[PDB]
């Protein structure tokens, strides 16, 4: 009781399964009871992407996220069009019956699965079409070719999405914005100590949340942020990282340029208070900006400064430092338990994608034949999926556009190159707290306003 397909000579996808063209993982798919594909030929991967027996949403999402390493977009389109155009089996010696069954159980389902691939492709990976206008031409003339009455509504929905893609408020009340010494409107006085530490953390969390949410799988798959075209292929990731680096460096700069010891203790305390509220907001990128500044070689050596830090804030810092220890053991656990909104640290995802792609082969070989290693791609797609799960939920916090501007336009390096600037910071560190046995000098005060923090607790109730 099997269908009887055409011969492989006329229709390539009728070639039966064997050890030479498709292999499976021993376990069955989550929620669905479908086989997990380990590896296959591109013909077999496309057969299963558009399989007649059942729909496979997981395989579709994973395939369309990761296919570009083993198959070109133009090739993929040609293959699904080839898949769509199914010839009927030749008559045996006479003549319906098995012919009408073939139309009902092979042709019609497969054609719908092909349309679903196009829908998903156009909806979630439209960048393929933006970068290759001819790909979009071929798609539209193909979609216009589809006649079936059952196909009509799926075709019309695909067209709707194409037209939409061709053209590029809070749930509950957010808390009141906090001000310390700098008044609203007076951007000229804005600094580390004059803005309210709560609001520094909130506005950096909004910036860093947006930066996190803009990064797409297309910037990550194929490890493209490490290759020569990284500025072309991964601009939003790089913008995100450059901000993180910017602020780490700004924290370091604030510390080492505050030459008076008492004032430097106030500066470090305030940065630890900002870390406290980063931690309250689950901005782990923010947490690690501070921890990286504190472990930088210019700041780490300032034993006279950290001596005068209140014990409570030492423990806040030490706790945050421990997240990174033992290959992010505590960070990993803490991220898995907390719920959105949050801003995770991207670096771990970067390393894991890179190592996954570097540490597994692109192809497996069986009986001399070459199979595409799909399980490798699934593992990359699982990581990009985890990245996406924290991009959906926004923060219930009001933007303050002047404070936003201040941190966006922050530029602690200036016109200096990296080596030049980090040498400057370290030489400053040696000036303000010389190496033993040299005596500790005194330095005059630079801040004419009060050093006392307003704390990390909201000033009014709501």
């Amino acid at each position: 009781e099997q269908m009887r397909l055409p011969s492989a000579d006329v229709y390539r996808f009728a070639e039966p399964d064997s050890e030479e063209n498709i292999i499976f993982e021993e376990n069955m798919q989550p929620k669905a009871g479908i086989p997990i594909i380990k590896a296959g030929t591109v013909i077999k991967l496309i057969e299963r992407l558009t399989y007649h027996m059942y729909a496979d949403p997981n395989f579709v999402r994973t395939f369309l996220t990761t296919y570009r390493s083993f198959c070109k977009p133009q090739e993929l389109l040609s293959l699904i069009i080839e898949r769509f155009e199914i010839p009927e089996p030749e008559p045996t010696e006479a003549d319906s019956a098995e012919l009408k069954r073939f139309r009902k159980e092979y042709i019609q389902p497969v054609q719908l699965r092909v349309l679903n691939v196009c829908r998903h492709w156009v909806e979630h990976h439209f960048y393929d079409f933006e970068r290759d206008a001819y790909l979009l031409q071929r798609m539209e003339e193909f979609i216009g070719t589809v006649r079936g009455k059952a196909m009509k509504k799926w075709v019309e929905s695909i067209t709707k999405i194409i037209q939409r893609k061709k053209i590029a408020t809070f749930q509950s009340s957010p808390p009141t914005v906090e001000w310390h010494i700098s008044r609203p409107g007076h951007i000229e006085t804005f600094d580390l100590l004059t803005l309210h530490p709560i609001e520094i953390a909130r506005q950096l969390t909004l910036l860093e949340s947006d930066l996190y949410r803009a990064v797409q799988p297309s910037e990550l798959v194929g490890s493209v942020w490490t290759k020569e075209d990284k500025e072309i292929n991964s601009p939003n990731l790089l913008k995100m990282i450059r901000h993180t680096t910017n602020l780490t460096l700004w924290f370091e700069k604030c510390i080492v340029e505050t030459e008076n010891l008492e004032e430097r203790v106030a500066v470090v305390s305030r940065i630890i208070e900002i870390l406290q509220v980063f931690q309250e907001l689950n901005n782990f990128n923010g947490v690690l900006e501070v921890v990286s500044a504190m472990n930088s070689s210019p700041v780490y050596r300032l034993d006279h400064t950290f001596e005068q830090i209140p014990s409570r804030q030492k423990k806040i810092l030490e706790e945050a430092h421990e997240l990174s220890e033992d290959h992010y053991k505590k960070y990993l656990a803490k991220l898995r338990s907390i719920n959105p909104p949050c801003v995770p640290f991207f670096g771990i995802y970067l390393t894991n994608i890179l190592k996954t792609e570097e540490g597994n082969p692109e192809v497996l070989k069986r009986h001399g034949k070459e199979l595409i290693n799909f399980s490798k791609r699934r593992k990359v797609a699982e990581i990009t999926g985890e990245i996406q799960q924290y991009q959906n939920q926004p923060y219930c916090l009001r933007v303050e556009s002047d404070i936003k501007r201040f941190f966006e336009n922050l530029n602690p390096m200036g016109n200096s190159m990296e080596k030049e600037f980090t040498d400057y910071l370290f030489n400053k560190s040696l000036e303000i707290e010389p190496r033993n046995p040299k005596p500790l000098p005194r330095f005059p005060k630079k801040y004419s306003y009060p050093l006392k923090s307003p704390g990390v607790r909201p000033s009014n109730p709501r």
């Binding site: 490890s223 942020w225 490490t226 290759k227 020569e228 790089l238 990282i241 450059r242 993180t244 680096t245 780490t248 460096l249 370091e252 690690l288 921890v291 990286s292 500044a293 472990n295 930088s296 070689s297 780490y300 050596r301 990174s324 290959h327 670096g347 970067l350 390393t351 894991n352 994608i353 890179l354 190592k355 996954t356 570097e358 540490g359 597994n360 082969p361 593992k379 990296e418 080596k419 370290f426």
Partner: protein
Amino acid sequence: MTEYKLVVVGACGVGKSALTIQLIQNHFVDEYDPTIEDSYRKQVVIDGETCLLDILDTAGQEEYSAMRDQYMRTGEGFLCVFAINNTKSFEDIHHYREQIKRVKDSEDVPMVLVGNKSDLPSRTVESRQAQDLARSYGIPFIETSAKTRQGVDDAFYTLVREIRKHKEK
């Protein structure tokens, strides 16, 4: 059982990952999952003394340039990796060593120079150039191949020997 915290450093497009992956993974299984704990821990026997290697490789995070000090301070010994087909990566080694010396606050930090050969393009850094550089720093040079797994054990094991030599001295 003594544990050695090793740290891999270098430019991107160098094969830092492949070096560490090939140490860790079994000699005849082309497979790896970096999420589990066995990914960066290996029990080995070096000069007949059993020890545990803990390798930190932060490949992919090179753009987080202000996090290097943090990552580096976790190490007792360091593999400074360059690619034999990338002259810039070789010329960058001087900065990495200078940064390591600053983080650890020591003039002699246990360290080895590693030249990794993956695939094309062709060699631009002759082994002589690297032997000379390594000699000026007073550290070993080891050349490795990602394709064939040649040199991988020698690179890590030499670093462990440098750590042991430093701890007596």
